[model samples]
Target: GLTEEQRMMIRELMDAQMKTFDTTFSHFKNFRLPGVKWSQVRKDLCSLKVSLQLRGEDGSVWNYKPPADSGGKEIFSLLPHMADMSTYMFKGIISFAKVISYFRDLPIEDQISLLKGAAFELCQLRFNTVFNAETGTWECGRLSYCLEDTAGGFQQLLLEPMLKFHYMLKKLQLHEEEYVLMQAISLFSPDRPGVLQHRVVDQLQEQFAITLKSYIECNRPQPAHRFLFLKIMAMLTELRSINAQHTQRLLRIQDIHPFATPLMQELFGI
Candidate 1:
């Protein structure tokens, strides 16, 4: 079980900042942007692109810019894909911030074990917040990245079953608190073989579960469904590709560490 001080920190976060954390991640709500004429939209797209020009070549600065309407689907797709990367990375760090803050006085090694153990689920859960279940995709303005198609490496192995999991979760229509508490529930897993602090993990996990049930009873539309907490937990267990996902998740975290924010290395021990 967690120390009393640690318990207070967790409660303090859940009471105030957990909702703040959830609010921080709701990017897609405002993601849809006004459509502009292709002329200007084309330039925004080109800003990141460049044409190869020889030093002696007769070309202006425009030579290095993306051509109007050039790249069509392929070029335009980068917009949402890059945005997804940004949004996804931000949530990972935010989740880390919350988790680390709760365990500040605990073992650093144990802190990292839980982070690596649960980072993917946390990432998946955060992305699900903005998921457009109707389209089976995550939306950024007019652009959408299918859950199964967003990135390469770890995601490719995971997304097949991952998307189906999202599909099922979408159907459940869990309340926001349900989602918030689930993140905690997943992060405190003590079963990951080498963790240094199973007692703390058990305490935090049980608190998250109990906290979820209590919230569900008051906030859920149908409170009589006493087993609703387990139902949500069961849906999470159905993600299906987690071992492969977690392995790949760590691999990519290592591979992409140099180009990524420092938070990835710090949180995942890359």
Candidate 2:
């Protein structure tokens, strides 16, 4: 947990970084891709760099760097950190007492329903901007498909598997179970159709028993539950990484042809 002052600083940094990205994207949109010279794009890139440097120097947030040869400067790393900072802002403001109060007041079903709704809303807010009508994809534009085709796709990946797992857990009322069992089952039972090929039921039962044992030993839930939640989130990040790598490879391949206009590049890239 961060101190109040630290949280405030992080909030400010996140807001500023989000604003910078918004401005940069707006500028990119306003400029005519076909008419804009690479020189002008270079100038815009410099402005972005200055914006990032100013924030990094003053924000006091963690420094982030993209891997070399990823065609990403610091922006890729900064964007994700900005997102994490936003989460901290919310946590800092929303007191634990308030959270407990709400949980205590709300029925378990309502609590679960509310969480699902909030998760969906967050997903939409994060991904709605990059929607592609032609391909009917949410995360990336049509270019994502091209990239996937060239460099092994991530079809029916984490999100699909997670959704299935979530559905099963909800149906089973697993959230009401002991925390360890919940974590174990959720982690191991990926929703792939044939994932549980042999000793499927037996494995699940054994995992359930282990989870129950952990829960019983702990008595009251410990703060370690938060760490387990973080692990699940880390798994999601790993899934997103698979997609991001594919997208980066696609962009690098496209960047090789400087003569191609942005419009042409975007179209062909797709």
Candidate 3:
């Protein structure tokens, strides 16, 4: 039983932290996969992942410094960079105390299942924060990953759909609160294949969905924005189709690059 004051403290902390969890200019931030380009981009972008630097046939150590070096490799591997970004996505969930506390209320297995099912969708949602529609790139930390930079790493078939999804979502210019709430709604989904406590998850997800709807109604009450709620929900549906394509894309390349980390392997069930 926490006091109201304590609750406010928690909310404030989470709101402040979640607001900037995935953007490019948030001090610093820190993936992989198509088997080839990772070796080249990892040298520069690996520093984006951590505070220290290291080199391997294929590894990017983390550190905060300058953006991608201008004179480095012009070609980039999108898969390895994606694998690295996945690490940060998992960290975002683990680092958020509020999410952890909510997970505590669920049975341990349920917690695991929910995370397994939701991490991919949540990452997509989080990545929306840094999507630069004008440049058509994702600004992660100091690196702006553009489509041209990802020629070999990303599959041709999936690129248009993924970018189209990002472009549509960015068109809305969502508030940070809306993105965070949407993630919660995604995380507590009752329809995840392995979730056993469907009732509980449904109630929790409903609470988040309602909160998001209320926020839109009150905060962005302009006539043009009246359908924002419906639009956001529709985006979630669109996200599902994108998520399926992404999963299939990853499966196609999994043998080539491997999940960057053990957690990725578990979460993606690959």
Candidate 4:
């Protein structure tokens, strides 16, 4: 009853998120660096990361970094400050208008459970858009947050894993369509704990997964690159492990300093 209908809705959903970043990168679209091989691709693809700058309409650079002074004080505030920022992001996930149509159709409890399960994973995907693989940093709006910038809030154990995951994904040089599709794939997961309608969720996820596969098939010319689809999917499994470690670190943060907010409460189920 719902194959093509659901597929059309998801195509719209994928386009909806890609539109947000369309303008900023239009200038750089034709300027990708060369020299990446199939296997040594990660390091060679580092070429694409060389021009890791987000430009403003006025053509000014949008790179902001932490100040040299008062490092000690700002360090302690980073964790709680991040919680506030992530709280804002979680709310934005609910506001994606296209998401509203499909998500609202689900049982209310399923909606809550899906959001809880996918919040951090979606954050990882969204934030990876701004990640600079070359510099080991994230270029958020006017501010560029590096790994050390977050060291105050996250444990050393957690920081490297997070950075490694971000770097690996960034090296893939995913098109915006692919990025948004992955976000959809993560959001419509059938295996999220507390899900009551696994079949429905699986159906939702299946279309996007195949859409991604077909997109890869049509776009990538080389036979070796065809495997990129599998490579991308495998990263999902790795994301779950990283998400678990991330949640564990957040629990420790609660014990150390109690970084609680209403959104965090629902997200962590605490």
Candidate 5:
């Protein structure tokens, strides 16, 4: 896709474009929450679910333990939903102003459509960085639990598929450059159905794709290594397939308890 020098050019562009998104660079404490600074530093940094559960049965609050009474409710209680994953809008991982700016840049409908289409994928990328294959869990900041043990644990559902996905992901050991680029790629998915700005999104992905090719060439040097780039992309495709399965299964129960989060309702089309 690009040359060594051209690779640098994209890196520069990434640096520049991300300038306004400085929240991506914020530090995570040994035990600090994504956007937290308080007398209590989010002892349970399983913060992703907090945003997802903002308006759950209890109302708009943070922290992710599904209510005690429903500890063993229906499938919806044990399984997961689309919004359970962490996202930039709630991660404080992206600046509020920066996000607002990005939203403003898009047409009103495009803004909603793109997010509804790709937020989960984009959210998954952030967690991918510290994924642990042995545990089928992510170790970002402080959250760590296997896919079958934690809140999002789809024990009888997505466990095997998720485990397989994480195993391959851990094996890839994607370069941070490639990983972040995947975040860009996930969000700018122009091909997502019903998206009006797919062309613009595709253009952005093309640039990232070009940069990824160059990264592989420069880092791998060996022919055998080039295969990894392609391999990583393939794994991402599989992850998408698994996500679809998970979503479809949960759709049956979504009506059992209407998604309280407005974004969740809109994005999942539940």
Candidate 6:
């Protein structure tokens, strides 16, 4: 078990690391470099994840320094994995998917807002894990459990809005309302599943078709847009389904806290 002093020191170190990461990421936004690759982004993510993990271990705070090589590739390639043992770490995975998609289409302000949301979710996941007695340290297992519950709550909030947005975005391209009706029918009446499943699957298919059409229509589609669209699709599909499962797991991690369940329910308007 961590003594009070150890926990306090760890918390302070984590606070500093979060600030540093936020500052660095803010600079990346300000620079607005064109045509950044996912591999590059993933590399940076790995570095940030590691730095946070190190800080959590024994309160070690390190200064940030640019690598000897100037390029993003070289720096990331040299970094080691800093995987958090807490099950809550999966929240980062969820946020990571959201961030990648938001970054693709959202303006700077929206991007920042979404990023902040991700950070907040991560914090919640981490805080919930602190109660486990066996771990001595914050338990990843507990964090993972809470993340599942939070993710389910997030899914409920997202499903209707996502369906609406998917429909609206598709409407921009054509006069036919059948596509819209098809979208509605497919979602509301899945032969095998409930309304939510039917809706999600149908919306996803429609979204994919729209993306395909856009790619074909472009006189010369940029490589970046093509790649980005595919990436967005992948992340959205994963989040739409897996997130609910994640949230359900999270809710079970701790004894049903009055505030936690109600807070999630309220967020989803249930």
Highest lDDT scorer: 4
Mind giving the per-residue lDDT tens digits that candidate 6 earns over 177-202?
22222222222222322223344444
- N/CA/C clash count, model 1: 0
Question: Candidate 2 has which clashing residue pairs, if any?
Answer: 181-211
The C-alpha local distance difference test score for the whole of candidate 4 amounts to 0.65
In what order do the candidates fall by TM-score, top score first? 4, 3, 5, 1, 6, 2
Q: Whole-model Cα lDDT per candidate?
A: 0.55, 0.32, 0.63, 0.65, 0.52, 0.31
- Give the 10-residue window scoring lowest on summed lDDT in candidate 2: 27-36
Q: Distance from true position, residue 260, model 4, in Å?
A: 2.6
* Residue-by-residue lDDT tens digits, candidate 1, 1-270: 344654564466456435444433334343322123333333333333222211222432211222345445334423433434555545544555455455565587876677666766766776677777664456433333443233222333433455657766776777765776787777777775568879878887787777777766656656556678777888667642564454454454334223333544454444
Better by lDDT, candidate 6 or 3: 3
Number of clashes found in candidate 3: 12
lDDT of 2 by residue, 119-229 (tens): 222222233234333333322211121112112334343244323333322332223233223322322333322332224433543544444444443443555454443
Clashes of 4: 0
TM-score result, candidate 4: 0.72
- Give the per-residue lDDT digits (tens) of candidate 4, residues 163-219: 667877888889877887888788888898999887998998887788888778777
Off by over 4 Å in 3: 1-78, 97-100, 149-159, 256-259
Residue range 93-143, candidate 5, lDDT tens digits? 233213533335767677666666555555555555656555555554323
What is candidate 1's local distance difference test score?
Answer: 0.55
| Cα lDDT, model 2, residue 45 | 25
Candidate 2 vs candidate 5: the TM-score winner is 5
Candidate 1's C-alpha runs over 4 A off are 1-96, 99-101, 140-143, 146-159, 221-226, 240-243, 249-270
Stretches off by above 4 angstroms in model 2 are 23-26, 29-232, 255-270
lDDT of 3 by residue, 123-166 (tens): 78777788777655676664555544233233333346556677
